[PDB]
Design a protein around this nucleic acid. Structure first.
Ligand SMILES: [Mg+2]
Ligand SMILES: [Mg+2]
Ligand SMILES: [Mg+2]
Ligand SMILES: [Mg+2]
Ligand SMILES: [Mg+2]
Ligand SMILES: [Mg+2]
Ligand SMILES: [Mg+2]
Ligand SMILES: [Mg+2]
Ligand SMILES: [Mg+2]
Ligand SMILES: [Mg+2]
Ligand SMILES: [Mg+2]
Ligand SMILES: [Mg+2]
Ligand SMILES: [Mg+2]
Ligand SMILES: [Mg+2]
Ligand SMILES: [Mg+2]
Ligand SMILES: [Mg+2]
Ligand SMILES: [Mg+2]
Ligand SMILES: [Mg+2]
Ligand SMILES: [Mg+2]
Ligand SMILES: [Mg+2]
Ligand SMILES: [Mg+2]
Ligand SMILES: [Mg+2]
Ligand SMILES: [Mg+2]
Ligand SMILES: [Mg+2]
Ligand SMILES: [Mg+2]
Ligand SMILES: [Mg+2]
Ligand SMILES: [Mg+2]
Ligand SMILES: [Mg+2]
Ligand SMILES: [Mg+2]
Ligand SMILES: [Mg+2]
Ligand SMILES: [Mg+2]
Ligand SMILES: [Mg+2]
Ligand SMILES: [Mg+2]
Ligand SMILES: [Mg+2]
Ligand SMILES: [Mg+2]
Ligand SMILES: [Mg+2]
Ligand SMILES: [Mg+2]
Ligand SMILES: [Mg+2]
Ligand SMILES: [Mg+2]
Ligand SMILES: [Mg+2]
Ligand SMILES: [Mg+2]
Ligand SMILES: [Mg+2]
Ligand SMILES: [Mg+2]
Ligand SMILES: [Mg+2]
Ligand SMILES: [Mg+2]
Ligand SMILES: [Mg+2]
Ligand SMILES: [Mg+2]
Lengths: 138, 150, 128
RNA sequence: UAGGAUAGGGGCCUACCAUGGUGGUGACGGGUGACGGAGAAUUAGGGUUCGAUUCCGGAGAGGGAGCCUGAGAAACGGCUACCACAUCCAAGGAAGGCAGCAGGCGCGCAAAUUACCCAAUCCUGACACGGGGAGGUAGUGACAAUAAAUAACAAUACCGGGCGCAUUAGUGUCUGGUAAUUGGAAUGAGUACAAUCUAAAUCCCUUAACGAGGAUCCAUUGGAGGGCAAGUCUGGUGCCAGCAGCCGCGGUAAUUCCAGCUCCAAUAGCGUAUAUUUAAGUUGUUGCAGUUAAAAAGCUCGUAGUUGGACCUUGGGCCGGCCGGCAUCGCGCUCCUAGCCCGGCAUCGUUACUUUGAAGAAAUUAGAGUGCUCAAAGCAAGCCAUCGCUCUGGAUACAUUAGCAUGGGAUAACAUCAUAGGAUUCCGGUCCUAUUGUGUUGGCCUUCGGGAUCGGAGUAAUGAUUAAUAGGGACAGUCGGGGGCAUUCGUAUUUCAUAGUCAGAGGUGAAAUUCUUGGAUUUAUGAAAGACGAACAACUGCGAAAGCAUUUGCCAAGGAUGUUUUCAUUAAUCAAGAACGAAAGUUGGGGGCUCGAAGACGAUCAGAUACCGUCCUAGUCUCAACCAUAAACGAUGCCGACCAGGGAUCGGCGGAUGUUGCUUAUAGGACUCCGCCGGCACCUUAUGAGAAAUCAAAGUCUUUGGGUUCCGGGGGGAGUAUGGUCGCAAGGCUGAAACUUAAAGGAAUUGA
RNA sequence: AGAAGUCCAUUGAACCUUAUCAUUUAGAGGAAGCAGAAGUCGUAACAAGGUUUCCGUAGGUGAACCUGCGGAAGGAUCAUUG
RNA sequence: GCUCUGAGGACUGACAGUCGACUCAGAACUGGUACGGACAAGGGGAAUCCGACUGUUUAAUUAAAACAAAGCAUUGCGAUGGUCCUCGCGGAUGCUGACGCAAU
RNA sequence: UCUUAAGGUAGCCAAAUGCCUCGUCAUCUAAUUAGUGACGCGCAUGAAUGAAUUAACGAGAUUCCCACUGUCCCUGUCUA
């Protein structure tokens, strides 16, 4: 069982330090690889799109989720990012200036889109919800 | 449980309630003390002394008849063994085992038992070093240990 | 090894939970009998024998079925008389009954006694 | 040690000498997207994460280095030099340092005015006057926080439920609303005379006149399948577009997409992303789990570490209404606190724990008072005839750990009266300093006072707890397929020999490869070789585990039992370290029967690199030396206690009369009965436990705490890469990440 | 008194060469893991999965896998007094 | 180069006297930064092929990767024998005997 | 499917073994028929004809880098 001697404070503290590492959340949060991800501990990241691509959807579904290959101005990563509205992809055009944010699930692929972790939230300095809602055209 | 086996025996000697000696024990403490020293200088350890009295001379417990333990009479008369009872006998058993093993090199069981016996020797010897019943330098050298005993 | 005042209380819980009339205890202690004095003072067990012929000792208590649980907190705590207040809630069933027995420089005594004499100490255990 | 230097201690530095200092209680090293703290967010408790930032401390002024002045600087809104950067040059030269305020570029997801002012708070100077991008005021400011509008009230109405009878009606009460219906009231958003505010303006607070018909003085954000509150609405799309945190929706009747109506939750706010807290008893000290779901090391030894059996007077009283003081069978006190001979006095074991006290920076937090109109706040302000002043407050708490101080001695560690070198009033021997008889300074001396030393007499209860259903050791009769060395035996298998016989034998479901009239198979006798030790042989023993079954001898060892023997806590578990550890496998001898990986064949089959049959190498066996793993299993660590019943059985012991194909008779051996321990197990039952299967130990668990070691945190990637280390090699031990995934998995039920 | 200069110490930037640490990054070729699809070859596993399964070790084979030696039941047997 | 300082010993009667050839460190000064001043006396590194190394070899053109080597394996042989010499008688291995001789 | 007694196994390579050949790719260089490292349907690699590696050693063969230099640009002079 546990060690419960009145003098075992050293053993218990060392043991918790040692055993918190098996916890996935602690390991992910302190291992330092979050600074080796594309955003590197950032919420959003402005990037330049290379091309509107479009990608397959997973087994139970069947569709073409319209994403884009974007380059990060900050550290040069090239990644894939979704465009979250109906027919919204048209607003995006090659080599435009977009803001890329996490797509949910905290850096983990979401839903039926295969291996994509990112969403477009701005383009050419105009709100993309506003583009969808004709509030302001770029 | 036995400290070097998973045996769990509880066989032992259960001491009688009355600390005072029984009626029929009427030999005097001085004569019992002379019996102690006679057999001690004849060369027997406290275990043999107690057994001898309990068998031939009808002395139930020497503490009961005298108020002082065998070793204490022997320590007061300066006949006490230089190396304690149980450390002596653990050393003698280690000498026997090692002498057998030096000729029987394939005896892995005897090698294990020797590991255990020397472990017991060293645990007990640390106790005797802490209670100052052994010299503060007495170290169990496996080489020249057979001179010490037997 | 033995660390009694647990070997006594767990025997008492087992005897009570089985409904036995008397339970006997193989080692004793001044601390053990001072704990049983707290139980008997607060009216949870009735009178008892302390067999002290010659050895560690032996005890026989008669259970009245009025006890419900009794334990030892080996890993005996430090305990101020300002902060029993969150041991009584942490261990005892409620704020009306149940007693936490803490050894203090005035001998073994329960936590309500410790409030009024305003002396703290080490947890020996509890019963409720 | 001596010095030099510093304002000063100091290896700060020098000369000489010594060989030391730190470390598994983590040094040194590395990371830190790390200034420290007061503190911030969240919080049942405990915690987890953060803290660049206006308060304190430190450090820097592009990077280093060096100095002047000065009380104060290694200053950068001071200098010198180098390096990086850059400005002016009339081409020799010269000036540099916004991480000060504002502002410009760049970097970025990310951050405002090149404003006014010395009036307040204070600083500064030679100083009541100057100065102050400290600091305040104003502009941008949905960072965060506070109060809080977007209507209210009336009768009319198709109406809509009782209530006045309640039938049979009909209209009735709060008005519920679709009413742009009708109606006069209320006001601030806004505009604005003015005043007030202000250093001057501005805002706020007041307030001339203006300022509401419901289209406006228009509220949005997101959502309407489940979670999760709100459409089995309507149109469009048709596995597309798309939605969807997850489960899922969409394949022509979409409650899930795109639209409209309706509605819902929040509401001047809400959605989104990341990080973090809660959820999370999914990090568990409180408070998890390890038989089977992830997890007991193969097993034992073992140092540190952690944990440690029982035993020592406050035992009974008075006394006054939780405690003072008392006495009893209280080692003494000379001195301060020291009674109207006497309470409650020094030095002559440590700690922890615990009580109380002090000191504890404010701000923050808790918390007292206080009508800023409330509230966030703030520290004010309230009452006189609210007429030449009264009463004022500006509390208090917390502050873990370390340090200081007082009371206790229960609990827990350390050290230790048995060699008495012990305690004890005294007696004088060694030698000593000097005060009052040295009125002055005094300096050695006789009883004196005192260290130190010192011998002998003296007294006292003269001084050592028990001996654990803890352990070690001894001893007695045993027991065991426990271990090592040697040694006897057994049939069988093969080979071979001698003799006999004649067509087959071997193998299979059936075959063939194979052997065979050079006589196979079979039978008998015998010899060699090496292996194996049947039956007996078991819910049986021994062993730390692996493992150990022919005989006798020898050698050491061992558990249990028995014990009126001894030691007296010596113990339990154990990072580091160490011993043994099946089979395979490796190096090299010996042996080479059987069997047999690889390999070669014959069958089968579609294939047959397999199952099947023949031959067979290594190997199987032994020795010397390695290896270190097994579903190494009880998938159940080790020591301890309690709890439920029974019969078996293994070993030891104790007690029974009652028969032995024994015994010169008995005892003893076998057997029957009863009881103890210690084993290996089993059968029944929950009153227990568990997800159950099941378990008398996996129980004594949310009524959660005996001690201790190892070890798990969804599934993969993977016991993989890399690094280390051991090994001849095979490999062993130690051992990630990226990425991917929504299940994988355990137990039981029904069906197939 | 007193400057340039100069001497010797001391602090010592800064550059240079090597060594080395750490963080990223290139690499022909080799070889892992994953995801996808409406592929090819088999039938290894789950029933006695058609040769019971599996663990350790060794050798082999296109692939699953096969076999040898030892072990386990998580077995298809809790069972010989019949 | 020169001037020094320090440490390391012997014999005789923790000290004193007598003697001592050397080695090892440290310092100050000095020179046209020259100093192992003549002589003597390794160039270093990254790799590939071959042979393990040491050794031997075509005297008078080839010094090597060739030959040998230990290590590994194989074969014959138990004396009336194996390999071999000899014209014959006889002889070598053998002053030997399988942990040996002999042939690869 | 024919055929063999068996069909080149473990490895290894334009290797001192590869004709085509100056093989293809990468590296080295300004430039490489050379060197190394890989690729292998290999005229004609391969297991005691021993195969693959292999630290140390080599008056062994080959390639490159640093120092060095009258080898060279490019010759000059001195001495016996
Ligand atoms: Mg988690
Ligand atoms: Mg799915
Ligand atoms: Mg026991
Ligand atoms: Mg142990
Ligand atoms: Mg000094
Ligand atoms: Mg930092
Ligand atoms: Mg500051
Ligand atoms: Mg500064
Ligand atoms: Mg400076
Ligand atoms: Mg400045
Ligand atoms: Mg600025
Ligand atoms: Mg909406
Ligand atoms: Mg929607
Ligand atoms: Mg909708
Ligand atoms: Mg609902
Ligand atoms: Mg969403
Ligand atoms: Mg939805
Ligand atoms: Mg869990
Ligand atoms: Mg498991
Ligand atoms: Mg085990
Ligand atoms: Mg220990
Ligand atoms: Mg025959
Ligand atoms: Mg048996
Ligand atoms: Mg037999
Ligand atoms: Mg394992
Ligand atoms: Mg296991
Ligand atoms: Mg019996
Ligand atoms: Mg996991
Ligand atoms: Mg299952
Ligand atoms: Mg199958
Ligand atoms: Mg099968
Ligand atoms: Mg099966
Ligand atoms: Mg095979
Ligand atoms: Mg085969
Ligand atoms: Mg099963
Ligand atoms: Mg050579
Ligand atoms: Mg020649
Ligand atoms: Mg030559
Ligand atoms: Mg001959
Ligand atoms: Mg090949
Ligand atoms: Mg080739
Ligand atoms: Mg070249
Ligand atoms: Mg090549
Ligand atoms: Mg060939
Ligand atoms: Mg060939
Ligand atoms: Mg061959
Ligand atoms: Mg050849």
């Amino acid at each position: 069982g546990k060690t419960r001697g009145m003098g075992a404070g050293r053993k218990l503290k060392t043991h918790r330090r040692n055993q918190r590492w098996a916890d996935k959340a602690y390991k992910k949060s302190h291992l330092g690889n979050e600074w080796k991800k594309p955003f590197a501990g950032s919420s959003h990241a402005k990037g330049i799109v290379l091309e509107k691509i479009g990608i397959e959807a997973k087994q139970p579904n069947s569709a073409i989720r319209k994403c884009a290959r974007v380059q990060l101005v900050k550290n040069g990563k090239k990644i894939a990012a979704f465009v979250p509205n109906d027919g919204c992809l048209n607003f995006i055009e090659e080599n435009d200036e977009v803001l890329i944010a996490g797509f949910g699930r905290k850096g983990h692929a979401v839903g039926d889109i295969p291996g994509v972790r990112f969403k477009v939230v701005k383009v050419s300095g105009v709100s993309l919800l506003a583009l969808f809602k004709e509030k302001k055209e770029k | 449980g036995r400290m070097h086996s998973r045996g769990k025996g509880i066989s032992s000697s259960a001491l009688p309630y009355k600390r005072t000696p029984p009626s029929w024990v009427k030999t005097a403490v001085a004569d019992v003390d002379e019996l102690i020293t006679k057999a001690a200088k004849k060369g027997q350890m406290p275990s043999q002394i107690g057994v001898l009295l309990r068998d031939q001379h009808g002395i139930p417990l020497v503490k009961s008849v005298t108020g002082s333990k065998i070793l204490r009479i022997l320590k007061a008369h300066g006949l006490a063994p230089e190396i304690p009872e149980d450390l002596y006998f653990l050393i003698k058993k280690a000498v026997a085992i090692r002498k057998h093993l030096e000729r029987n090199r394939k005896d892995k069981d005897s090698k294990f038992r020797l590991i255990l016996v020397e472990s017991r020797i060293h645990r007990l010897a640390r106790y005797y070093k802490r209670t100052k019943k052994l010299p503060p330098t007495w170290k169990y050298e496996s080489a020249t240990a057979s001179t010490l005993v037997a | 090894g033995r660390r009694i005042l647990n070997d006594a209380l767990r025997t008492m819980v087992n005897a009570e939970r089985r409904g036995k009339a008397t339970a006997q205890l193989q080692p004793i202690s001044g601390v053990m009998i001072s704990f049983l004095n707290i139980m008997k003072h607060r009216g949870y067990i009735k009178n008892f024998e302390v067999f002290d012929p010659h050895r560690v000792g032996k005890i026989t208590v008669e259970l009245q079925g009025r006890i419900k649980d009794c334990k030892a907190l080996t890993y005996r705590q430090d305990l101020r008389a300002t902060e029993i207040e969150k041991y009584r809630t942490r261990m005892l069933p409620t704020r009306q009954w149940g007693y936490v027995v803490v050894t203090t420089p005035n001998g073994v005594l329960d936590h309500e006694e410790a409030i009024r004499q305003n002396v703290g100490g080490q947890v020996l255990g509890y019963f409720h």
